[PDB]
DNA sequence: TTGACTCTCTTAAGAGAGTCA
DNA sequence: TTGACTCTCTTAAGAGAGTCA
């Protein structure tokens, strides 16, 4: 709503709901052959999802609160970052998944940071593979590997140099 | 174009444009600390770009050729790959920039590989910081470093557990 | 046959707000 | 008030295709 009080009661709320949503147990690769378990508090994937809660696509919900008569809304797993700055160096602070199980809403697999940040975790090298992100990956990402390349760096002729 | 050689002579053609676009010399980071250098042959800022250039778009180009009266066009840096698979793993192939500079037309600075591959290498640490890319990076990653994450994982109860 | 413009669209990470009941 | 739906938009990596002289 507008106070600092107010939004403690919103994250508190949020918290509360979400602590009641099933929790599944996933095991993952943190890099370096390491092997970690999370503890994913995951939203249902039809209704009813939680006090407050709804589904606006298909892997997007929002956390509705009617305060002082007047209704307030945000991106599901934003709440916690509620009293956080919205912007970072001029880009919007998203909610980025440590563990990219979308469905979570398990706070502590929760950070804040740009759009940026919050894709490249999905190629790092995990937690145990040499990942160098201050706030730590819990996890080695999903897209990290050699890749599947078509093709490299080719050319017919004579006319470029690397 | 239609046959493989007619294919062969578009490629030869816009390799022979793109060839005399401004050289550019970049000092790069490699990762582990070290510093290396590419040449980037780069299509002018605005009109005229080169025989069979087209901008579609802010950092968007096309390349053009009327081959027996009928019209052919490709984004700008697709016509290296124009023999090569166009999906993979049912993906669709997308020009890659080792370099990372959108502008560069230098084939031997691109590939041929899936979106998220192409992403990915935002954040790779280089080929001297530990790329695992089957085919290896020619700098480290724009992206690449500790972030700028503005809050991590949070919880006010103890309604959650990793 | 060409050049220089015009447009909307794709993917995955993410977001905003409106309609009913 | 609270729930269950509906819709389009953002961002960078990338695309195809139309007009006109
Ligand atoms: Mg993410
Ligand atoms: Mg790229």
């Known amino acids: 709503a507008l106070t600092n009080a107010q939004i403690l ?15 599944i147990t996933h095991h993952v690769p943190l890099g370096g052959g390491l092997q970690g ?3 994913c508090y995951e939203i249902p994937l039809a209704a009813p999802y939680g006090v407050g809660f709804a589904k606006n696509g298909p892997t997007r919900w929002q956390y509705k609160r009617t305060i002082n008569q ?6 599901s797993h934003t709440v916690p970052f509620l ?7 001029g880009k919007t602070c998203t909610a980025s ?16 940071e740009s759009l940026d940040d919050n894709k490249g975790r999905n190629w ?4 145990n593979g040499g990942c160098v992100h201050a706030v730590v990956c819990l996890r080695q990402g999903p897209l990290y590997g050699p890749g599947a390349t078509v093709a490299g760096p080719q050319q017919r002729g004579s006319h470029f140099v690397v």
Do not use: K, M, Y
């Open 9 to 23: 009661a919103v994250i508190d709320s949020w918290e509360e709901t979400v602590g009641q949503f099933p929790v």
């Open 124 to 127: 790092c090298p995990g937690p």
């Open 37 to 39: 378990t999370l503890h």
């Open 97 to 112: 998944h440590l563990c990219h199980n979308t469905r979570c809403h398990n706070p502590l697999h929760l950070c804040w």
């Open 70 to 75: 007047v209704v307030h809304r945000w991106g």
């Open 83 to 89: 009293l956080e700055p919205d912007n970072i160096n």
